[PDB]
Symmetry: C2
Subunit: 464 residues, 2 copies
């Protein structure tokens, strides 16, 4: 009886978005029941590509909890191989606040309509549980929002000016990244970025597809200006957040106290630890790069904040580690280790999404490949920075969460929106898969509802 397996897992609620299913759901891992779900198209969102999410601390998640889940829109419908005849996809890019009340989900608000900012990639909660960030890699905008007031705390645009305007060499041969703090342009203090407004490229750079833009496979109005912002992850000690830009392979560290970028960490192995940021106007900063060696994927801080990880991808596939023990000065954060493996020397697998154990001693990293190679989970020693093991799971692996007692990693794989999908559970003492639960979802995320701010240190806050 599976109840014996569920009794081991504990009282934890898994949230998942469905990508092309258009759903979001919560599953009680102590009983195997789905507690509630919501289907975006029921509400008249005609292109509900439910993408990323983060949940806030709830002292008792079974009585109620809240979360943010966002969507993509426009031509993002057409890039996963589904033979649809749709000609006019919905504009999408919604950011929804959803509250579970102990019985059902309630769609509380559409923060993208309220604020004017439609952003479609990672959603992260702040370490205090009272705000959240959302980034978008077609618009290259991110923003932090106050949850209670459903308002914008700050929003920034990041732009690339390539050294070589040749699309194939626009990143390799370097460029200048310009960071601008945005101000609302419409009545009510609203921004003008709903739906597809602001997209530099007509659809996202898909998993494993960062070089598709330079290889001429993605259309858009400002192709050589894209940086592909992906997430803003938070130092659990406070003060700093890290904005990942996939194409230049940089993590820009912002000071959340005065909302300014302070240094840019450079992913690639062999490249400097960081580059400086120069303030050039009241609201504008720049970073200059003489070259870009490789794009990058996901970033994260360890639970104590003293390590920061950034995954180089495609041209290099490795885990880059900085010593971030100096909380006072991120200009002093230096590369300390790089995890590499002879099996990672091809274009794939990419070192992808991560989750640390609460004690910080191990980090679990998904290994992504295109069809048909089985995707998996790498287990890394987060003290000596060594690969310990790799386990195969299934096609199209995405994110990992962990139960807050440290005992089980929970991941999702998503079938490239058309083949096998599921929720995988891994025991962190044996590092073996306990098994798979069925899942109708193309999830690119998953979160376990936290009870406390200390749980956010191992949630969709410190890492993606």
């Amino acid at each position: 009886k599976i109840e014996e397996f569920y009794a081991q897992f504990g009282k934890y609620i898994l949230l998942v978005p469905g990508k092309f299913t258009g759903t979001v759901a919560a599953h009680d891992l102590s009983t195997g029941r789905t507690l509630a779900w919501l289907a975006g198209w029921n509400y008249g969102d005609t292109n509900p590509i439910m993408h990323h999410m983060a949940a806030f601390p709830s002292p008792d998640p079974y009585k109620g909890f809240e979360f943010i889940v966002n969507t993509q829109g426009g031509k993002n419908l057409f890039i996963y191989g589904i033979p649809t005849t749709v000609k006019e996809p919905g504009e999408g890019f919604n950011i929804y606040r959803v509250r579970y009340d102990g019985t059902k989900f309630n769609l509380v608000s559409n923060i993208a309509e309220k604020t004017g900012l439609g952003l479609g990639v990672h959603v992260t909660a702040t370490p205090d549980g009272k705000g959240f960030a959302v980034a978008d890699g077609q618009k290259d905008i991110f923003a932090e929002f106050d949850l209670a007031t459903e308002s914008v705390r700050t929003a920034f645009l990041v732009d690339w000016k390539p050294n070589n305007s040749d699309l194939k060499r626009a990143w390799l041969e370097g460029g200048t990244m310009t960071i601008t703090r945005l101000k609302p342009t419409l009545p009510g203090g609203k921004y003008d970025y709903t739906g597809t407004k602001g997209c530099k490229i007509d659809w996202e750079l898909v998993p494993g597809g960062e070089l598709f833009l330079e290889e001429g496979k993605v259309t858009g109005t400002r192709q050589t200006n894209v940086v592909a912002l992906d997430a803003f992850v938070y130092d659990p000690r406070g003060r700093w957040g890290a904005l990942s830009a996939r194409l230049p392979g940089v993590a820009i560290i912002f000071d959340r106290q005065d909302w300014e970028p302070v240094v840019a960490l450079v992913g690639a192995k062999g490249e400097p630890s960081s580059l400086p940021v120069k303030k050039v106007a009241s609201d504008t900063w720049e970073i200059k790069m003489d070259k870009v060696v490789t794009p990058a994927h996901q970033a994260g801080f360890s639970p104590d904040g003293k390590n920061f990880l950034f995954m180089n991808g495609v041209r290099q596939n490795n885990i880059m580690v900085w010593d971030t023990s100096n909380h006072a000065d991120p200009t002093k954060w230096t590369k300390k280790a790089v995890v590499e493996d002879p099996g990672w020397r091809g274009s794939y697998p990419n070192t992808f999404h991560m989750v640390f154990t609460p004690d910080g001693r191990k980090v679990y990293v998904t290994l992504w490949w295109p069809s048909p190679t089985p995707n998996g989970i790498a287990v890394v020693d987060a003290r000596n920075w060594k690969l310990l093991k790799s386990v195969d799971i299934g096609p199209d692996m995405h994110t990992l969460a962990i139960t807050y007692d440290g005992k089980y990693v929970v991941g999702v794989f998503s079938g490239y929106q058309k083949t096998a999908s599921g929720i995988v559970i891994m025991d962190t003492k044996s590092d073996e898969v306990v098994g798979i639960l069925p899942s109708v979802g193309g999830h690119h995320d998953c979160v376990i509802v936290p009870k406390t701010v200390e749980d956010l240190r191992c949630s969709r806050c410190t890492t993606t």
Copy 2:
């Protein structure tokens, strides 16, 4: 966990999602979802994925096909989702989907091809080469040929009340008219796509049969609704039983010449049957002096010798006929009625069913509105007594069984808003072995058959 799934065997579960808009296949041997499809990705803007049946495949893991249909229109507005949509998609599609060992492929929309948009139960024929679909807003059913995607037969069923007052329109009886339909558009197409033909604006929801007489359902032909629900097949061949929920009748059709032959009356205390009189080359009538209670699901046992029909709401019971005479459905007589004092209220309703392959037991869901736990009744199908009731979860729907007869698999659906899942029950102990998570509002579920014999225990002989 591997221990858990290993017990079940290599059986694939298909589910539709209702308000999720999806259909999915789950491999019960590993826990993996093999493939899913989201209707709205194809431009179906109101994909209320409702009912389904799968056809026998020699190796489901390499490929199989099934039909899944949808509802549409204001059916979006009746499960308490606070949507601001004003113009819901027309829906009422009938999709043929093929798994190819990797993914689902949307093959065709048989509603667009034929012009018959029908949104309630889908049943495979016993030989696996055709399927029926009924609709309880339009009160039409049709049997289709799979290979040519064409209509074999189509009927309309209508009510003429004795008492035109809507509260009395069924209680005081009426005449049920059955008419063979013919296509009205060029190219042999019917004119029933979308909401065309709806006598009421949305379906009578689970447990909600008396909502129409209670004035809770808009539409232009309220007092003429019978709420056809499904066409289930005698596994011995020849006969099919069309259930009409509001008169509480199961009309038996001869598939050979497509005529109705006898009408079984569900209610306890009522005759076994009423005769069906021919009044024109394409028209038959059944006259009822009263309707005692509405009815729900119907089914034949695997050997065809028993037929069940669930009375609901005014009576909640399992009516059982002796159908052992295959030659003559006018000899089919009431032989037993399964009752329990705990079913004396309006709820629970005795609902969907599955029999064990050897015909020894039948599992019957027990439906209630929120917040009462819904469950499974286990019934001894030799002496027609209730053995056990087990509580599962809110809003229980259908049941399937693995073809080796070892596990009943069911779904519960949260009223489209609260808890849902897949439940697996061991048929030796009659205990629940586990719940698996499911993002679904499913009103159906099927395990992909390998043979025609498997259809005796699938979405063919019963709902």
